[PDB]
Every structure is written in C-alpha cells, then in structure tokens.
Chain A
Amino acid sequence: GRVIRNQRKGAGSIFTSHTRLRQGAAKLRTLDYAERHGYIRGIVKQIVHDSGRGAPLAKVVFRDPYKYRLREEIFIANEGVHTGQFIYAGKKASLNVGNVLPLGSVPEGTIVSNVEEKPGDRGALARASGNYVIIIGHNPDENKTRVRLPSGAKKVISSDARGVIGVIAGGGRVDKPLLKAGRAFHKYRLKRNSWPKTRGVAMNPVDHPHGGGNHQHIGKASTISRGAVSGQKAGLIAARRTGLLRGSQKTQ
C-alpha cells in the first residue's frame, strides 16, 4: 500500500494544466507551396517575453492566402532583430542574418529555430528531431543530414525544415547560481511540479528497500533495472559510469 513518490502520475489533478500564465503554443500555421523549397518569409514585431522562462515570443501573424484572415499566432522570437524586421530567406535568392532555410540549401553553421523534423507538415506527427535552428553543419550527400550536439548523441535525418536563424538569452541563466533563494513553489508552478527530490534517512523506515534503518547508509544498489520491475524504480536507472568532470578541457 505504501507507494513511493515516483508512481503518482495516474490521478489527473495535481499534474494537469497549471500554466495560466502562458498563452499559446509555438507550432507554425498551415503549410503550402511557400513554406518549403522556394520562398518563405516570416515576420517579428511585438517581442513579448515567453511566459514561464527566459525566451522571446513574437506575434507572427501571416495574412492567410486562402482566406482574408489574420489570426493572431504567438510564435518564437529571436535576439538580434529590432521592433520589426521581415525575413530575407530565398532559396533562389540569397542569405543574410536571421533567415529561414531547410537543412539542405545551406552550408555548415546554420542555427535555425525549432518547429518540425519532417519534410514540413505544420507540426509533424512526430518531434523526435531537433529543438530548432540550433544546428551546426549538415551533409551535402543527398537529402540526408548528420547533426551533432555536445550532449553526446548522433542523428541522421532529412534536410527540410522551417527554422529561422536567431538566438535566445538562455546562456548564463543556468550558469549563474540561484543566489537570492526562495524558489521551488513558484519555480515549478509552471506546467506541473518536479523539484522536491526528496530525502529522509527515516522518511519511510520499516521499508526502505534501498537501505537506511537508523543510520545514514544505503544497502541495495540504487541503480534500478529498466526491464525488471516497475514497482521499485526509485533512483538511478541503468547506470554505467561515475566520475568528476573538471573545468579544464583541452582534450582530443
């Protein structure tokens, strides 16, 4: 009967919509002949800050070619542009600063925005692709593209996307310690809650399968197997290494 606080997401209450503060999504509108190989132009004016974190959002509203309507669509903005600057991204034209081109019509060094990973389709039924323009070099070989990130993974996919060049002031926010503390509730009153990460040498005594009793010491390995039991998964999963990464790089 006494469960652990890893098996909670099955009530639909304290895990539901908790983000009044925000507005809309970020996925683009209807795709046509324009928003792909040929000619695609974007806009950015009211750079309203992204609610919940540190990012900009723009009121990218396109005059619908199919019908006289200008539905307000809050999309992701970028840093470097002022209050109003149209995108100059033409496949049959050229390239400048802050443009939107597929991952095939551009050479190495192309950090676009995130929207989709599939050859376009207004939010591909998937998403296991890139997080946006954030991409270095590509691959001239056919329509394939080999991306790479310092996270430690590889991926080979297509070379078509609707991401625009631009940056977001996020670097430094996590590099600068939460000095003036008082952050946990309003911290992750954002979308849900996942910041209690939470201890007790005697949190649940006549139990602790890990190891505790009456003294600060564990017993069993906190490395719970992935395919073994879904009733003991409390702590590390599928361990391999453990060390200390120093600041001095200069490696191979």
Chain B
Amino acid sequence: NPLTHSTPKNFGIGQAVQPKRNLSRYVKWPEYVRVQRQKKILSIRLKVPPTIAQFQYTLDRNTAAETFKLFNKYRPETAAEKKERLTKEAAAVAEGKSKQDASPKPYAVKYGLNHVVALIENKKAKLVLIANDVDPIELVVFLPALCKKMGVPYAIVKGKARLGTLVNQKTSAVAALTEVRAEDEAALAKLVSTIDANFADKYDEVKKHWGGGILGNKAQAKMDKRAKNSDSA
C-alpha cells in the first residue's frame, strides 16, 4: 500500500531477459497450413472465373432457417431403425403376401449432385442446392447450367453436411420435391418466388462480368495510401 508506484518497466534490451508475449504466429504453422491458406482461395485474392462467381454470395439465415426445418420431417429411416423393422413386417409382407401394399408412402426428398440424369430428361427437378467445399474444381462449372437450360429453379446455398444427417450419410446435395404432401404445400411454393427473384435473375449479368476489386492485406496499406498523396497531398 505505501509502496504504490506507476509507469511501465524498462529493460535494456541487451540487458535482462524478456518473457514471451501474446504468441500468435510465433508458434510456427505446420507444413500444409502454409499451403492450404494459399490453396482454397478462388474468390478472395485475384479475379474469378465467369463460369462460377457464386462462392462469394451467401444465403441469409432468415430464409435458410425455414429451409432446413422443412427438410426435417422428410428423411429416410436410419440403419438402426430399419433392419429391425424387417422383422415386424414378416407377418404382413413376407407371409402376408403384400408387396408394397400395406405400407405408408415414404415421402423422401429428392437428391443428387454430380450424378443427375433421370432428373433432367424426365423433368423431375425443382429445388436445387449447391455443395459447400467442392473438392473437384471441374465438377462445379456446369452445375447452374443443368438448371438454367431447363428453367429449373436452382438455389445457390452453402452446406451439405447437416443435410447429410437426414439422408443417413455424411454429405448431401440438392433437395427437390416432386410428390410433396398437402401439409407443406404452401411452405414449398412460397420459397419458389424467393429463389427465382434472388438467384434466377442473376446469371446472365454475372456471366458477362468477371469479378474482383477485393482488398488484400498489407498490399492495400500502401497502394491506397499512395494514390491519396498523388492526387491530394
């Protein structure tokens, strides 16, 4: 109490020993870390390919919330709750002689990404989603084209992992509805006008323009400061 002082302490740099500070980059980064930070960039650093230019655009959490909850009621039964079910229908289907007769209709949501054939020629495509990570770069430059030509309302969304839980897998894809019940009939057609007015109207204009002008880092801390003194010092 009586020995109360102030002012920061000073060490003669060459003298004494200094302790570790808030180490952020000091703890040196692993091998592929310096690689991955320069790997998955695409729409951050330089220009972007006109064939894509949709990874920078994200969907609001106000519409995506009702979208995910809509697909909650529509999901196939898991392996833990299906194989045991086969023993229950042993005296109704097998010994009952009723193949797909005395069973409720499995209203399952549509799916498929890099493997879509019968959902185009037969015109059975409605709500179309896009993957998030997308490791094959060559398998993303023709995804909107599979919906624009047929006039299929495609929705540029980010995520397929949580939607992989309602399909008994890990990763998902699109989620269209061809044979939906009357319970969610008004909750499906309402989202149609939203997607078409926020995604379908922006394709031809996006294809023409390239895309860039994104600020970097220390680069904009000198380049933008140079034009300021060059015009009005």
Instruction: List residues of chain A with CB under 8 Å of any chain B CB.
Output: 34, 41, 62-63, 65-68
Contact = CB atoms under 8 A, between A and B. Distances in A.
B13 A67 contact: no
B17 A34 contact: no
Interface in B5-31: 13-15, 17-18
Nearest to A69: B17
Given A34-B13, A65-B13, A67-B17, 10 more contacts: A34-B14, A41-B14, A62-B14, A63-B14, A63-B15, A65-B14, A65-B17, A65-B18, A66-B18, A68-B17
Interface residues of B, number: 5
Contacts of A66: 18
Nearest to B17: A68
Contacts of A67: 17
Secondary structure of the A contact surface, majority rule: loop
A10 to B, nearest CB: 37
A68 B15 CA distance: 9
Contacts of B14: 34, 41, 62-63, 65
A34, A41, A63 pick with most chain B CB within 10 angstroms: A63
Nearest to A62: B14
B10 to A, nearest CB: 13
For B13, B14, B15, B17, which residue has the most chain A Cβ atoms within 10 angstroms?
A: B14
Most buried by B among A65, A67, A68: A65
B62 to A, nearest CB: 50
B56 to A, nearest CB: 39
A67 B17 CA distance: 6
Interface string B12-56: 011101100000000000000000000000000000000000000
A62 B16 CA distance: 12
B190 to A, nearest CB: 62
A65 B19 CA distance: 10
Contacts of B13: 34, 65
Contacts of B18: 65-66
Contacts of A68: 17
A67 B19 CA distance: 9
A67 B155 CA distance: 58
Nearest to A39: B13
A185 to B, nearest CB: 45
A69 to B, nearest CB: 9
A107 B111 CA distance: 77
Contacts of A34: 13-14
A191 to B, nearest CB: 34
A149 B48 CA distance: 54
Contacts of A63: 14-15
A6 to B, nearest CB: 46
